[PDB]
Ligand binder design. Sequence first.
Ligand code: PLP
Ligand code: PLP
Lengths: 595, 606
Amino acid sequence: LKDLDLNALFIGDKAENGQLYKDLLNKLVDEHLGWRKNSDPNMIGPEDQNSPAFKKTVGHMKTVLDQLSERIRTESVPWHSAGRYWGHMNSETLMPALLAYNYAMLWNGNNVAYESSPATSQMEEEVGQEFARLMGYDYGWGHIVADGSLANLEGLWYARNIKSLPFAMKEVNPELVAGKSDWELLNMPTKEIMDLLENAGSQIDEVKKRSARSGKNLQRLGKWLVPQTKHYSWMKAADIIGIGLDQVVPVPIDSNYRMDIQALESIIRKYAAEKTPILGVVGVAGSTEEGAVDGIDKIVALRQKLQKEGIYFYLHVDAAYGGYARALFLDEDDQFIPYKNLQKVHAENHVFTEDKEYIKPEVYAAYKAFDQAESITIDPHKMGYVPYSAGGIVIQDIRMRDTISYFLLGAYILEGSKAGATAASVWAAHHTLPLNVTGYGKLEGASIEGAHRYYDFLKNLKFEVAGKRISVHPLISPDFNMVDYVLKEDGNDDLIEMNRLNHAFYEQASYVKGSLYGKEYIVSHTDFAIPDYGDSPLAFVESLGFSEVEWRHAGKVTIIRASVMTPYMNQRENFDYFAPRIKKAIQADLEKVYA
Amino acid sequence: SLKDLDLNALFIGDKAENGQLYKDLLNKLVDEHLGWRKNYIPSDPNMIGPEDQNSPAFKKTVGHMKTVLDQLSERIRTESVPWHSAGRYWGHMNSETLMPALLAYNYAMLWNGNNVAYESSPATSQMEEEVGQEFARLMGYDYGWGHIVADGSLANLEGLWYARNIKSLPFAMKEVNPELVAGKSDWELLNMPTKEIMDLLENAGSQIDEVKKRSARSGKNLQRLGKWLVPQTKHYSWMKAADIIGIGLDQVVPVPIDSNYRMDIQALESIIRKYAAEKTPILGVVGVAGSTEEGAVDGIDKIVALRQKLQKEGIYFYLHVDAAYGGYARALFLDEDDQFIPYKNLQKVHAENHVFTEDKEYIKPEVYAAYKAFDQAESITIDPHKMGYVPYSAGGIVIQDIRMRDTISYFAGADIPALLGAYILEGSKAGATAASVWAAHHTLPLNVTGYGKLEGASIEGAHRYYDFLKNLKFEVAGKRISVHPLISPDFNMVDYVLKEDGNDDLIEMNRLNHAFYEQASYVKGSLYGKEYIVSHTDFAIPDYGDSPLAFVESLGFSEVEWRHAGKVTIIRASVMTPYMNQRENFDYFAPRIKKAIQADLEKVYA
Ligand SMILES: *Cc1c(COP(=O)(O)O)cnc(C)c1O
Ligand SMILES: *Cc1c(COP(=O)(O)O)cnc(C)c1O
């Protein structure tokens, strides 16, 4: 697939490939309709179709769809326009994923029961194998979940039930764990748990009855450690799963907005000295507001270190946003690419348009260590470009599914009924674009390169407006494809005024419901506030000349946010066209803020 | 209002009779979306041009995409179960969905909005809010709310998350501010009616956040919250729900069902009293409206009356109605202004709105009484993708009082949430799913003018099937074989057994019905159309207790036989098609079904 052309796989910002989409859709719908036809005799005949009541019912249906159409066309946000839109959301999806959904949903199969939908059931089995291969799990498994928040919950459900198994085994058959103290039982590695459970053989059902599934001993299972900026799905997941919000422990992040691994170790050692177990740790690959990648490799090394002293924790990687990026690192046979060969393999497969370093070494090392996590959340509906709703969960060892199972897919998942059409959509996206450099690598690469062009363009911007001098100050070089920055009046050390400036700028560079005048530059915004960030933004705000005192008084810094998900800005010629226009739009927006 | 609505026009059709209408409307919708991307906000220039489209690499990539779609297309067509044809298919699944629901999904998916945050997709967010208001009005809630859930198992989990959190709130208030609940013993605090808990919480005012912090959200006090009582045949989503939500499997208590396969309310009361006498609370009770294998409708009215009785003795329990299957059937009892129809006006209103083609009694009085009492439940599960005829995947949950949502909410008057995602159990959710349900509900209002007709047509078809089965006799290989319907249907599921006359071996009757099922079913790769297709299931003692004893005894089996076999195999039908309500249509298939049953029995015995 060396010459795979991404331009052919999307409808396009201006529906440039609309006719292709229509042609393929009509062909697939014809195939379904032919299939229903190809017996007797017609429940609905030409006598029915011609009646006055039938035609009036058709008219009624058409009126409701016209009302639907009106609302969606006039209340939706203007469609994203590459080169102008530098905000946090993307709605564009892979055309083969849209088509496959459109076709499959005509069968209306339900993937909880193989019977109702054998082909999409098999497609979900294949997608789960494809996730496991992406993450480097030789004996793993995965499935499609309604969304990544529920995948996170499923992750905690595994961790919770797994932690509780050693004691459950002791209750059912003390010889399975003979000689182990309670602190050893609370610090058994997950592989050793699954090997014991396998040895328990026929007693697995009784063992499961005495596990956390029984509701007993939940608080004993210990602390769930997350970065302080965790997505709120994690707080909900601890609430829902019964360990509770009291057991969630925030771990400080560093100046790169990554979980501070020295602080992680200090927290873990302090709980372990009290004999409080660590239920698990969440590492994030692709944070929600900075696209930061945590040092998953540093967490795995820390765990190996602590295992020597009798301490173990479950590791879950929340890669809801960053999951598909592991495709950058896998060759056409799905093998992990050595770091020194990376630029060469990328150049050969046209992942990046220029041959330079694009991936930070510590980002590479973090992604390399995924295969050591017990479980991973990944969302086709984010950076997989599959339409909502489609989340995903990957587990390291397929035997883990027996810890949550009920008495095939339906027996092994948190949720109930699910659309076979969803599996068709994800399956079609994966087979059009393999999960390595030949497929998704190119798509994730185009996004990263457009984020780098944008980042490079923003670091040298100054504006003269209403007698004042304003500079752009990028937050950090992006780990992935999110780029953040602040505007600031030169020499002005009032953080509250800087906050007000970025907020007002955002209001000038954003649409409102009903907007029809196109804007040349659209951004997003968010606040980094002390309650979720602590002092992680302090070095940045001090670098700008604000004092620590000023930080505590304002209590937050307002940040202009961009998640670069369009593939079109990777090309120098495309980006260069918009760069001078963006600069003119920022200048006019500042004129309006100060007027 | 909509008196002449013709249901035939709202489906693609078993033989794709309306396939061209579907394709025409789909193509109009797609052109409207494509014209919107191009022109709603005119811009220059195009990122993809004719010089890109005509390059060899582009054409080759199109070729590769067509190959993948051709592969998908083949696998689904060659592996799928043959499409179900009304009059031939009498089994437990339906795949036919409303055409406006399908078209609306197809169209809205092109924008790909996410309904977790309003700002992201305001039109579909507004549609989901209106759908929630529609669910509330359907269930008779004066100030309730609802929303679409990924599926009905997760809606039941959400139900339990509400009951768990609400139960824990009076203790959390005690812990944060003892004056709020001064003078109430612990047993009182664990038996406060939900509305009284919500009023106290509103009074907590500025301390609400601290109180939620100390509630079951914290992970503290879960085991003090009490038992979750469900009918013995519960959908497994409940055992699973208890495990997930942290109260544990050990807190689920099965309540015996009666000979109608409804929860036995005398046994419910006895269990509750038992627990109360030892000061164990009841976390809540699940009433099923439309059981999975019999379509039975539990006496929700009798549960409500019991709870009013027990409240005089200081006992309260949360009530959740699982109407995953039977939720939309409430539209049978609502007039065009959405008011509940009195029972004695029901046949008249149904005749005026053409809900049933013959003027007879279809709705049992105890079924009417049960649906009327839905508005007294704290929460209700309802699945648009079952009897709503909306495509998978779309579940629903309705809550009796909008204020309840503040007990489970997060922030990261009762107007539309800015982050729906903060009032719900799940996370990201397709705006296309809200569009699809919205379009269904506006094409077919949730009352006699709309869904009443569709739920009615299903019910009337189930009754025709029931009446046909009731006196069916066959002569095969010298033996005399009768059909024995389980019970007259509460809703639209119809169950029966075949039995050799005079033979008392329940094991043999079981083996007859299994073999019959194997003859009247498809296998993967079936191309010969069958005249008759059925489903089957076992009523086994672990799940059913002695509920089927009266029935098997009415056939001539002994209690001892029952215990030896430990189960009775049942032939099952969920009559979901709308086409069998008409006499004409059904009468055409009746002799053909009878012929097919005779031929199937001949093969069984050969
Ligand atoms: C968006 C997101 C989630 C939740 O995923 P949904 O699919 O939106 O439910 C979890 N974690 C992170 C890091 C995310 O960005
Ligand atoms: C099917 C069903 C459920 C589960 O709903 P799904 O949408 O299939 O997850 C719950 N309760 C009852 C009574 C059911 O029939």
